[PDB]
């Protein structure tokens, strides 16, 4: 008997729900009390909405309690007979003004420093006798002082955007809140400071030929002397000299950041001109050699969304028609990844035939986000209205799929497929993917989708506005404690914050978001977080408790997009 | 009915208590239940110890509940009829392994950066047309991006040690936990990284002539262009060109850090030789010109404790007898500050006549700490046994004074005197001091004293060991929520964390410790934290909610000393 809630709070003018975890499909009393937390007096009577089993999640039976129409600010909790929820807050831009500072502190806490950053001034390029100066940037995870543009390059369909995404997300934040007087001056300064710190690093990560180094990998040794520019593969981190980052391999996103970084009135250790050049150069180089840098030699959706962003950002900065033309092409290419099949319409396909769907535990939003950046700069109304309808259909999909089974928690669902298994709709990603091993929590994904929904509202019918308000909130709610494990994954907030590997001195950091909750280790249709079986297996326990900078970066853009939307 | 507890936990083999806040002097039933938090079954029956009123603290009536003899690890809470305490933990080195990481993250979060640090490369020296490169170090407070060796130099008896203390505390931490296998290798790396970052800054803060710059002050403007090397006075921060830091003005401590920094196998942006030189040079320069740099031209206790440390650290590093001789002199001088008067024995005197006692809301420990560093290096057994007895008597004092009135909370008491009041024993400092305005929370002071107790045990009888174990714990307990305001002052831990000025974007940072609780604003014998009267007055609300790097630094040394002691 648990009343699961957002451990932080709900928007005054926003969707609000909770979820009841119990034993039965119905109870005697069908009502829940919203109670003022100071006065302990009831302030609303709430109807329970029955549901029960969810996929095959062990914990028990789950039900929904909506209290959206309630719009009076303050602190409340839910009560149900004996049991009552944790206190939460209803206010305007609650998440933003509560967490934003701490998330940014996290980033500043995880800046590459000391021994490691000294060494990163003279880093071996694998297989050569060359060095590069690639100091700066952020350590990637609670237990990894390696620094990434991307990894899992070898699986092809999995490449997550890492250090670049951080930078671009931050710049994109500054963008939406420039002119917003409710965003404090010091708070704007802090976001520039961090963003430009990142930009500098991205600029340093570009080899003179025009490509960007993909990884600075230490094989998880925490050895200074093992820090090498490379790629790697498998869970044993076999290093390889394919360190050229293609569009999907984090290069596309690195261009987009540096182009946006160029538009700031201030700059970092490098000038605005320095950034823009590195962007333009880096783009036309990949326009030539992308395919040579792709492990399977075929561009997929990830390349398409990444490159579109790069072009959209370069046009904005330079106003040079070439880039609008390139955007237009990439957009048309991306719109082609919109596929319908015999059991679901307008899903995103990785492959061009529609045989393997797109699904991502990190950047799942970007398809729609990237199209929205295009729509923002596309003045020809034929092109606009075409790709407008793509964005509309893709959002209709996200809603359709997520509401096609019993889903009290509102957890965004997705179309997945394993290397050797059938296309199926799912809560979590296919564990049996091309990596051979890789799967973890999706907090990044959730916040990515949340961000997508908020940023798309400009280009969407007001028919589908309110539904996405809910979808996006339900995603965020999960991250901060409206989940079966009654666990806030944002550290230093809510309850039951998970740590990673304290006994080895690899702690989580306050303000960071951890990987999060996954499908069952043994049972794809169950749910798992640090399950007893594998909780102590250091080969597996990374999947849940460990923090990873994309989770934070997407959370940061989500809360800012949310703040802007109210 | 509140059962106040440590919001984190108690040592398995450590003193444990709670405090009952209620209405009455006695209750009907006189017993409290220690309850297992997982099984909800009783595990001990605890006697209440009656007390009632404390000084003139408004909240109500206070009683003690001791449960020290209970030594079974796990999670428990106290229950008393309907009401129960917050869950807490009993384990070995509980505070250290719970917080250490986060406190260090805080420091890395508060490193001087961005536009501010760029500007700190070319800082005007007030009244001249000179520049100094003083980039690095940590921002001083939640709402101050100025960087300090010390301030309140003008009041003479108030100078707190700031940036140097951080560095020295950290180095001193590394020292006690070198060889300690329970301190993770990565965790040692992080502490060096941060310490050496600090050392570099202290090295940069030394003008070539041999003195150190006292402050890098921006008049709280958060303006880049207002950053000037200077001193200042009053609450309006009137800048002045007396920027030479004497022994008490943070110079003594800066020497001590750089000397200890020289002993590390690794080094920062400057070499071990660079640090040692800056130390030796800086010392012999102050040995000459100290008096010229003191606002009132007279050395007081603060100079004596600061300089002793410097000498003790320089002897350890160089093994050059000159410094042991200097230590020996400073020690003899400091022992002279031990005074008895007609109502209290072996208090610390600021002035040489004993007319104004020493009391400090920051570094109150150092007298005894500095003598202990001397005792650590003093081989002549006459000198040792003399100053041994001083350290013994000074601790007997701290215990005597703190147990002379109804004191359920165990809050270390102190001998104070104002500009406008008689010598009196007190909980908090004299608000009516030489600053003209300055008084705040004493969390630094508490942790300073805790640290003192742990580090002194080597040189103390086992007769007075257990009492100081309790005193030190009772200090720490207060910081993390065993206080009338049921408030953990360590951010990201316990309950009711206070923020500072979020509406202006001057947030507290997770891992930091804030100023804390004070005497009543209107009533010296009451207690205050963000009281309604002054809570919104921005001229006064700094006194409570604001974070300040000494609180953190002393907390960090306390938890480390504690960890070492069990």
Author numbering:
A (entry chain A), B (entry chain D): 1 to 566
What does the paper say about this structure?
Based on sequence homology, VC0615 was assigned to glycoside hydrolase family 9 (GH9) of the Carbohydrate-Active enZymes (CAZy) classification scheme, a family primarily associated with endoglucanases (‘cellulases’). In 2008, a large-scale assessment of chitin-utilization pathways in the Vibrionaceae suggested that VC0615 was in fact a exo-acting glucosaminidase, the substrate of which was the GlcN-GlcN-O6-P disaccharide resulting from the import of chitobiose (GlcN)2 through a phosphotransferase-transport system. In contrast, a substantial amount of starting material remained in the cellobiose digest after 1 h (both reactions were initiated with 10 mg ml−1 substrate). These experiments demonstrate that VC0615 is a substantially more effective exo-glucos­aminidase than exo-glucosidase, which is in line with previous observations on PBPRA0520 and the lack of cellulose metabolism shown by Vibrionaceae in general. VC0615 forms part of an exo-acting glucosidase/glucos­aminidase subgroup within the CAZy GH9 family, alongside previously reported structures of PRPBA0520 and VP2484.
Here, we report the structure solution of the V. cholerae enzyme VC0615, which was solved at 3.17 Å resolution with poor-quality data reflecting crystal lattice disorder. The best molecular-replacement solution from Phaser indicated the correct space group to be P3221, with five molecules of VC0615 in the asymmetric unit. The VC0615 crystal structure contains two relatively well ordered homodimers of VC0615 in each asymmetric unit (chains A and D and chains B and C in our structure), as well as a fifth highly disordered molecule of VC0615 (chain E) which appears to lack a dimeric partner. Difficulty in packing molecules of ‘chain F’ within the VC0615 crystal lattice provides a clear explanation for the high degree of disorder observed in molecules of chain E, and may also be a substantial contributing factor to the poor diffraction quality of VC0615 crystals in general. Calculated interface areas were 1294.9 Å2 per molecule for the A–D dimer and 1289.6 Å2 per molecule for the B–C dimer. Given the essentially identical calculated interface areas between the A–D and B–C dimers, as well as their strong similarity (r.m.s.d. of 0.32 Å over 1129 residues as calculated by SSM superposition in CCP4mg), this arrangement of VC0615 is likely to be the biologically relevant dimer present in solution. VC0615 protomers are comprised of two domains: an N-terminal fibronectin type III (Fn3) domain (amino acids 1–92) and a C-terminal (α/α)6-barrel domain (93–566) which contains the active site.
